Design a protein around this ligand. Structure first.
Ligand SMILES: C[N+](C)(C)CCOP(=O)([O-])OP(=O)(O)OC[C@H]1O[C@@H](n2ccc(N)nc2=O)[C@H](O)[C@@H]1O
Ligand SMILES: C[N+](C)(C)CCOP(=O)([O-])OP(=O)(O)OC[C@H]1O[C@@H](n2ccc(N)nc2=O)[C@H](O)[C@@H]1O
Lengths: 205, 204
């Protein structure tokens, strides 16, 4: 079992007498020595941290026999810009992921698009996300180049769970509930369907 | 690290050739030889599983040098009955806890009140929860009897976070957003009463 949370990128002592060398799917799947695990990077908002996230993170932890899971979490600032609102701000979301079971390391304030230097800095061998193209402004897929590098490792999305769902579950209930106490309208019953959807647009795609 | 989730209670084998024998704070804090960890029970709804929960569990895991953390998760039925609603469904919250870092095994469909024979089958050495007396049912504290056995290990609530808080953030903005679009009166005065009432349904 684990008694303590996951190290932030900062806490950890890293060595540049160690050159940057990735591994190959074959070399990684044959499985790595204990001193040299495979290093994988998964990224996201992780708003309303839930099972869908955690399973993806488990998928990611298990890609190879010996693996080190690092997880980039984006800032509120970057997220509100390119995506929509978070219900929970970055610190809560930083704390959340630290408590996940398969998480070795947390990377704060992580970049929307990944750069050669980020990958070199954090010594990343592969990258874990779902195989849908991510369109964030200017790009049809922001993982395209990581895919092309052969660096990309796809994952599977859990069904029935998502941050939109958790929001729509609540909002749907309050909508009818508020209006009910107002009675104690007709256009609302019509626009209720219209309002809720629009509301969740603000939270992304 | 850990590549796999937490077992459930049933999913694991248990050998009853071992009689039920608890352990004192003393020889527990002295530390427990490997094959005999200390077994601690923490319980809750874990609706909207969050970091207040997760750290609560971390303390629980850390109460002793060698500690086995069992965590019970109460049913929708029990919860809707004795507490209020859950936006998360019992099967969802069963899954949530599985992915927590400090949790060795999960116990589905937990009791609202803990019983001698429940503590017997799960071989529970101690119990971790906050020291605020828990009043539901007719009990003004449901842990009092567990307290009195000296079997209780308190924990500390995190702050700024709780399952009720995540509701109000989401809720609030929508109360004002809807009304805003609505114009396309007097709701403002009552608005605070509304939200408050809405969160009463999920508990205190
Ligand atoms: C901004 N990026 C593109 C750099 C990082 C990706 O941003 P994002 O919006 O995909 O982050 P997110 O928090 O929505 O998703 C985190 C990860 O959890 C996975 N996920 C999410 C929800 C869900 N029900 N099942 C999942 O498997 C997604 O595939 C993703 O790989
Ligand atoms: C009903 N019981 C007593 C049988 C089980 C306990 O029910 P509960 O209402 O305490 O469950 P809950 O989900 O509200 O709390 C779960 C656990 O997380 C901890 N917790 C929760 C929120 C928070 N901000 N800080 C915390 O430390 C609580 O101490 C509790 O131990």
């Amino acid at each position: 079992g684990l008694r303590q949370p996951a190290p932030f990128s900062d806490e950890i002592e890293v060595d540049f007498s160690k050159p940057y060398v990735r591994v190959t799917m074959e070399e990684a799947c044959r499985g790595t020595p204990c001193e040299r695990p495979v290093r994988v990077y998964a990224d996201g908002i992780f708003d309303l941290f839930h099972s869908g996230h955690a399973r993806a993170l488990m998928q990611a932890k298990n890609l190879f026999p010996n693996t080190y899971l690092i997880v980039g979490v984006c800032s509120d600032e970057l997220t509100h810009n390119f995506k929509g609102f978070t219900v929970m701000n970055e610190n809560e979301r930083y704390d959340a992921v630290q408590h996940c079971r398969y998480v070795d390391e947390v990377v704060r304030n992580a970049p929307w698009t990944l750069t050669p230097e980020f990958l070199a800095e954090h010594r990343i061998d592969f990258v874990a996300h779902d195989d849908i193209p991510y369109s964030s402004a200017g790009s049809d897929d922001v993982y395209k180049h990581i895919k092309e590098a052969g660096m990309f490792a796809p994952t599977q999305r859990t069904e029935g769970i998502s941050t939109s769902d958790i929001i729509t579950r609540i909002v749907r209930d309050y909508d009818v509930y508020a209006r009910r106490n107002l009675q104690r309208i007709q256009k609302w019953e019509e626009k209720s369907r219209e309002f809720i959807g629009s509301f969740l647009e603000m939270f992304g795609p």
